[PDB]
């Protein structure tokens with residue numbers, strides 16, 4: 109709701125084994141669940157009615173139902189389901205690179221022609 | 227009476243549909259279509275007061291009520307493509323026969339306050355025009 | 359036994375759903391296609407990779423080279439002018455390609471099943487018809503609910519020119535056979551047609567049993583002296 | 590080029606409308622020109638007539654062997670073996686044919702125009718459809734009233750085969766656009782399909798207006814002093 113835009117935002121994953129539970133994966137005050145170090149981020153764009161959260165580096169373990177929380181007076185809780193299908197990523201970078209102790213670096217990142225306008 | 231096809235509020239028309247699947251002759255069944263029209267007996271032709279006589283001719287084109295003039299999203303292979311939905315969606319312009327409970331309708335009238343005239347604004351539907 | 363060089367456009371499938379508008383410059387009928395070079399008038403990704411000399415009618419050689427590039431300049435209206443530097447002759451031959459002009463946009467219609475198929479209660483036929491379009495390329499797919507049906511379940515014909523009421527326009531057709539049980543239950547079907555003259559490149563029509571020609575019609579006219587508001 | 594001998598079957602367009610079904614056993618690929626002539630296996634009352642040759646890729650030859658003896662012994666069940674002999678490798682080639690069995694009938698549907706076209710006062714469009722027949726030979730005509738329309742006012746596609754389980758079947762379409770003044774007058778139109786497995790060799794289907802007109806229409810006028818509508 110737009111009239112409580114100064115709130116705190118959460119991102120919890122449905123466990124669903126004993127009774128149902130949301131372990132908190134990330135928040136707005138800068139705390140990450142340590143298993144998700146490097147592949148989770150909550151962002152504030154576009155604002156004014158919405159916000160985004162980005163989950164990459166997908167394996168087939170991540171197929172689950174996800175919930176979003178805020179500490180506002182009114183509580184909309186919305187459910188998103190992530191599936192996993194067959195294919196390969198559009199962007200391309202190598203495997204996790206190394207670097208020298210004290211010398212320059214360069215890392216490419218491809219993108220196909222659908223992403224040329226962007 | 228169970229699934230709604232259109233509910234149009236500029237002309238106040240509503241069209242529903244239902245399959246009346248009976249038991250005798252278990253191979254044939256009918257399809258019913260209900261149309262409801264509410265006719266306003268005291269509105270003007272343009273919705274602004276002094277213009278024209280009260281409207282006396284009401285015309286409903288069912289090919290225009292039923293159309294969908296807006297894009298939509300389709301997933302073809304592994305993609306999200308934006309499609310249109312009709313062959314007739316070029317140019318609001320449609321004349322409205324009734325009001326609509328969720329929209330203001332205001333007018334402009336000149337009056338006198340000693341010297342100059344003014345540009346008084348006037349509510350035509352007073353329930354919908356509070357500034358909130 | 360004779361040279362003749364042609365230029366083929368990009369396709370429609372890879373340029374609408376994607377944008378990877380590769381080109382191809384190839385002639386067939388040479389004499390000594392072993393060492394040769396090719397010309398393309400601009401070049402950015404200059405790795406125009408060679409290929410094997412696939413034989414043709416009565417066994418003469420054929421060149422093979424692909425020009426890359428994608429669908430922003432072909433949409434903007436550029437030009438490409440590939441010609442040859444053959445090992446078999448003395449003065450080359452020229453051909454060019456551009457985006458097509460004076461384009462009309464199609465009209466899509468979906469036709470419900472015929473009446474006598476609904477009595478026999480095995481399988482019914484849908485018919486998608488697309489009409490009046492000046493370039494000769496088109497795409498036709500099918501959807502059930504929101505799921506794309508795979509391509510082996512429907513039959514689509516080719517594109518041919520209709521009788522000429524002044525200017526040359528074309529036509530295409532397609533059919534799909536589904537089960538009578540789930541047409542009577544209430545599933546919905548769609549035919550999605552994509553041609554480049556359309557403004558958003560695609561258009562869709564959806565049809566189900568409830569939104570069709572009825573057998574019963576009830577009409578109610580209510581005269582309201584109270585108000586003119588329509589709640 | 591390369592030598593090959595094949596042969597044809599008589600065309601349906603004058604097998605059902607006449608009795609001049611000329612067969613053909615033509616060979617193609619000959620180092621020298623025509624010096625060959627033929628021999629047919631039955632004794633059908635005439636012998637073959639040979640025509641002047643034609644040109645092909647780089648110098649290949651082809652002549653024809655027409656057997657005009659069609660007093661219909663073909664659907665009677667004969668076999669009609671051909672035999673040619675050329676100044677080439679000394680093997681006089683052979684060729685078979687049979688008029689096959691395992692046939693099926695087609696099922697013909699004639700569809701009414703879509704609604705958007707009707708509400709626009711221009712040309713309206715009609716659709717014929719035939720499907721399910723076992724050999725891929727068929728004819729499609731049209732009729733307005735009783736006069737047959739000339740064959741350059743309608744478009745018809747090829748005959749392709751439809752995906753199913755095992756038993757191979759084929760399909761074919763055709764369209765025809767008439768003026769809306771002709772439709773709303775009350776003139777009828779007909780599709781007509783010729784096929785070999787039909788018992789009387791043809792099938793009609795006729796459409797006009799009043800086709801799917803509804804059976805019931807209720808009109809109720811609720812005057813004020815009685816208004817009670819619901820949300």
Ligand SMILES: *[C@@H]1O[C@H](CO)[C@@H](O[C@@H]2O[C@H](CO)[C@@H](O[C@@H]3O[C@H](CO)[C@@H](O)[C@H](O)[C@@H]3O)[C@H](O)[C@H]2NC(C)=O)[C@H](O)[C@H]1NC(C)=O
Pocket residue numbers: 272273274
């Ligand atoms: C139905 O009646 C209304 C009321 O007149 C018509 O709307 C308005 O018509 C006037 C005609 O003088 C237009 O005048 C404009 O006024 C504005 C003031 O905001 C001024 O900035 C302009 O330069 C011009 O003088 C006005 O465009 C128009 N629309 C509004 C106020 O929204 C209406 O056209 C009538 N409908 C029909 C179908 O006749």
Ligand SMILES: *[C@@H]1O[C@H](CO)[C@@H](O[C@@H]2O[C@H](CO)[C@@H](O[C@@H]3O[C@H](CO)[C@@H](O)[C@H](O)[C@@H]3O)[C@H](O)[C@H]2NC(C)=O)[C@H](O)[C@H]1NC(C)=O
Pocket residue numbers: 668684685686687
């Ligand atoms: C239509 O033409 C085809 C060939 O173009 C004919 O089919 C062939 O017929 C021959 C003899 O009738 C078959 O040869 C067989 O060889 C075996 C040896 O394994 C032998 O044991 C048999 O007694 C017989 O001689 C051959 O299999 C067959 N098929 C081919 C070549 O694919 C056919 O006869 C012609 N139609 C008519 C009506 O004659």
Ligand SMILES: *[C@@H]1O[C@H](CO)[C@@H](O[C@@H]2O[C@H](CO)[C@@H](O)[C@H](O)[C@H]2NC(C)=O)[C@H](O)[C@H]1NC(C)=O
Pocket residue numbers: 165204
């Ligand atoms: C990407 O490769 C690097 C290379 O190891 C991994 O990053 C860390 O590497 C150090 C030293 O090799 C280890 O001590 C850490 O345990 C690694 N981090 C983690 C989270 O395991 C990194 O794991 C690789 N990326 C992924 C997604 O596995």
Ligand SMILES: *[C@@H]1O[C@H](CO)[C@@H](O[C@@H]2O[C@H](CO)[C@@H](O)[C@H](O)[C@H]2NC(C)=O)[C@H](O)[C@H]1NC(C)=O
Pocket residue numbers: 437452453454
């Ligand atoms: C493309 O090659 C053709 C060769 O067939 C060139 O031909 C001319 O095309 C223009 C149309 O753009 C005509 O107005 C001329 O009359 C054509 N010339 C002749 C002799 O017929 C053409 O020059 C090439 N395209 C460009 C852009 O130069």
Ligand SMILES: *[C@@H]1O[C@H](CO)[C@@H](O)[C@H](O)[C@H]1NC(C)=O
Pocket residue numbers: 156
């Ligand atoms: C937020 O969205 C509403 C919706 O119309 C808009 O009126 C408002 O101006 C927007 N606020 C900002 C800061 O963009």
